[PDB]
Each structure stands twice: as structure tokens, then as C-alpha cells.
Amino acid sequence: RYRLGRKIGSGSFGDIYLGTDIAAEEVAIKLECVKTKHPQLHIESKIYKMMQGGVGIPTIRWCGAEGDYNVMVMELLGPSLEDLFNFCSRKFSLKTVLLLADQMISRIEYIHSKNFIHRDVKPDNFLMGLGKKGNLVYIIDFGLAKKYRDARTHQHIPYRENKNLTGTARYASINTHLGIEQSRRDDLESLGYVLMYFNLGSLPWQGLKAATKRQKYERISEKKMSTPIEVLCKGYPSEFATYLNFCRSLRFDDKPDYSYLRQLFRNLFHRQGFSYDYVFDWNMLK
């Protein structure tokens, strides 16, 4: 039922295409070769299905195999926060950062409530909705997602060390750089780096080259460990440093206090005099 359009980029696993549901609507299409190596697309599809119904969780319309590809068809979403960041001249107003922070914490909480961690929290994996959902932040891409507790007993996965970094180095938590198994705290710590990225326009560990990838990650790790939160966040409201310190002090199997983290930013929002009219920076482009 689906005509494949132009390739719009790559995902954590497989290629992404702008596509068309010939009968009705435009859609997004993810393809994975059915026989190249270890398969991933069908597991990710199963996670989306477990996530179904949650606020800001995309709907899948069909998932199967068509010839030489495993295919997943997703409702079309709007631009990613990295796209919108570029469109807003790579700087977000405080109001927009706080509006985004409120929803993004909630999306991460939702994923955690369904027993999974995302492990690649970054602007590219959050997309705005379209039409009646144009003010809603969605989260995408479960290719790196992992179950962190047992569905029946809620027994947390064990602590593990000497792991290779998974996800994007720019936003990875310090413990991830140190080879620790990722848990709920790490999704939230990554979000903290995303919010300061939006505030600052960059992070101080961006753009570092080296010979091998290990050395580059090592530079990023060292720069992150050697930059105190009060220096990273210098000049910005204290809530951002409070947020990051809170995430960095969580124990491996701690349940984060998502409400407290949201309340930090909500209190700031109201002390700044902003109104929750869901008018983001991009809503003001002329």
C-alpha cells in the first residue's frame, strides 16, 4: 500500500525514507535488510507496540517483510529538535527550553514506566507532532533501548562494568564513559546535557578530534569529568545545575523523582513570568 519516496537519512539501525501510503497519507518508512546479519527491526517494532498508547509515542501502521527488506511504517511526524534548533539559529529561548524540558522528562518517565531505558537521548530523537499534535514532543528510535527491570518482578538488572559506550558520545553520561551499565539515571543525565546544549548553543566537549574513536571518546570523557557542573552552567538559572547534580547522584537502581525534576523547571518558568501557551521559538518564525 506504500510507495517508497526519497531517503531522508539514517537511523540507529537501517535507513529512513519519506514515503507515501498510496491510498491515503504520507508516512515515514524504516527499512532493514532481511538477511544481512543479526536482525533488529522486528524487536524495535515490538517495543513500539509495547509503548503504544502513551503520550508522545509514535503509532506504527504496519510492520512486515516486503521482498529484500524488513519494513516498518510510522505515522509521519514533524521536525526533530535538532532540525528546529537549526531553524531557530541554533539557540533556544529559556521559555522554549523549559517547555521542552517539561515534556521530555515525561517521555523518558513513560519509557521507564514500561520497563525500558532509551540509551540515546539526544535532540535528533525527539520530534514535534503535526496538526492537532503540533505542540506535542514525541520520542523515537528504540534501536538501542534495553529492558532495565523484569516485567513481572521489577527486579532491576545487575550492575555491570567495562562496557563499551553505546549511544552518542556528546550526550553520554559520565558513568557511561566510565563503562558502567546504563540505567534510568543515565537517560535523565543525557537530557540534562541536551538542555544545556540548547541553552548554550554547544557543549564544551563538542568538536574534538583524535586518531582512533577510543581516543576521541576519551577526550570527551575527560572534558566532561574535568568541567564542574557549576562551570558548565555558569550564567544560567541554578535549576539546570540542580537538575544535573541530582541525576549524577542517583544510585544505579534508583527510581528518579521525575516530578521533582519537572517541578524545578516549572518553578523557574513561573518566576521568569512566562505563560504556558505552548508557543515555542519556531512558532514565531514569519
Ligand SMILES: COc1ccc(OC)c(CCC(=O)Nc2cc(-c3c(-c4ccc(F)cc4)nc(/N=N/c4ccc(F)cc4)n3C)ccn2)c1
Ligand atoms: C511534510 O513535509 C516534510 C518536509 C521535510 C521533511 O524532512 C526533510 C519531512 C520528513 C520529516 C521526517 O523525517 N518525519 C519522520 C521521521 C521519522 C524518523 C525515523 C523513523 C522511525 C521508524 C519508522 F518506522 C520510520 C521512520 N527515524 C528517524 N531517525 N532520526 C535519526 C536517527 C539517528 C540519528 F543519529 C539521528 C537522527 N526519524 C527522524 C519518523 C517519523 N516521521 C516532511
